[PDB]
């Protein structure tokens, strides 16, 4: 399956923070959207996920233009999303965090949701945290719960907004292995970072964004030799 954004644009108070951005991510690849803080990476995700109204552009899955669908209807079409900052429910257990999403899985019985919650906890190595409150977890543990919670919806694409932020060095390694596993599972993974070299290594290809504009696309090796990328990071 293919997720495509075309000619996205967004302005705040007359300032165009995203302008004419197009990108695509297919099942089974990790695609980066990388660039400085304030370049418009999150705004682009917001428009793809449906969180803020776009000023221009289209969001498409395969042959379906879903531009008019709100966030939760786009989710049913397969779009998953990891917010940039904490989004775990801070005073709900890890288990109840998973069940907040598993409760919308109409394809599952009571027992099957419990099974699926248990499988997700094993898969993401959080089963020792079942009754722990979200607030009581480290940044890395919270991150694993947040990713498991998005997967409870069974998305086809997952947009990871700076998944390494606020996570200690050891947990970063674990999140990287999670990302590879999500890709091996058939998800198209779109990931943002401002630290280009580190995240670039885990991408099959990446778009580079600067001041709301796409300036380059390529494999990591092409990006690191791209003259437009270079004249931006002089």
Ligand X SMILES: CO[C@@H]1[C@@H](OC(N)=O)[C@@H](O)[C@H](Oc2ccc3c(O)c(NC(=O)c4ccc(O)c(CC=C(C)C)c4)c(=O)oc3c2C)OC1(C)C
Residues at the interface with Mg ion (CB under 5 A): 41-42, 84
CA distance linking residue 37 with residue 211, whole number of Å: 9
Does residue 33 interact with ligand ADP by CB under 6 A? no
Stretch that binds ligand X, among 18-26, 68-76, 122-130, 212-220 (CB under 6 A): 68-76
Q: Which of 1, 56, 86, 172 binds ligand X (CB under 6 A)?
A: 86
Degrees to nearest 5, angle at CA 33 with 213 and 71: 95
Q: Which residues, at least 6 apart from 207, have a Cβ–Cβ distance to it below 8 Å?
A: 23, 31, 32, 33, 34, 214, 216, 217
Q: Quick one: DSSP state of residue 134?
A: G
CA distance linking residue 182 with residue 185, whole number of Å: 5
Binding mask 120-159 for ligand X (x = CB under 6 A): -----------------------------xx--x------
Does residue 195 interact with ligand ADP by CB under 6 A? no
CA distance linking residue 192 with residue 195, whole number of Å: 9
By the 8 A CB rule, do 97 and 55 touch? no
Stretch that binds ligand ADP, among 20-28, 32-40, 67-75, 179-187 (CB under 6 A): 32-40
Tokens linked to 26: 């297919």
Q: Which of 3, 8, 30, 41 binds ligand ADP (CB under 6 A)?
A: 41
From the list ligand ADP, ligand X, Mg ion, none, which binds 151 (C-beta under 5 to 8 Å, kind-based)?
Answer: none
- Which residues of the chain form contacts with ligand X (CB under 6 A)? 71-72, 75, 81, 83, 85-87, 100-101, 149-150, 153
- Residue ranges for the known binding site are 35-42
């Amino acid at each position: 399956a293919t997720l495509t954004a075309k000619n996205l644009a967004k302005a705040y108070k007359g300032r165009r923070v995203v302008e004419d951005v197009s990108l695509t991510v297919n099942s089974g690849e990790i695609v980066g959207l990388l660039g400085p803080n304030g370049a418009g990476k999150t705004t682009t995700f917001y428009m793809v996920v449906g969180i803020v109204p776009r000023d221009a552009g289209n969001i498409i899955i395969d042959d379906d233009d879903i531009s008019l669908l709100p966030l939760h209807a786009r989710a049913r079409r397969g779009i998953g999303y990891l917010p940039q900052e904490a989004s775990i429910f801070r005073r709900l257990s890890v288990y109840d965090n998973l069940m907040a999403v598993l409760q919308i899985r109409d394809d599952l019985s009571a027992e099957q949701r419990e099974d699926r919650a248990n499988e997700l906890m094993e898969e993401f190595h959080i089963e020792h945290l079942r009754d722990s409150m979200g607030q009581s977890l480290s940044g890395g543990e919270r991150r694993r719960v947040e990713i498991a919670r998005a997967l409870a919806a069974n998305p086809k694409f997952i947009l990871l907004d700076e998944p390494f932020a606020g996570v200690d060095p050891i947990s970063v390694i674990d999140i990287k292995r999670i990302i590879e596993h999500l890709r091996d599972s058939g998800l198209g993974v779109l990931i943002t970072d401002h630290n280009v070299r580190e995240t670039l290594a885990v991408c099959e290809r990446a778009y580079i964004v600067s001041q709301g504009h796409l300036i380059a696309h390529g494999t990591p090796t092409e990006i690191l030799q791209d003259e437009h990328v270079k004249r931006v990071y002089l």
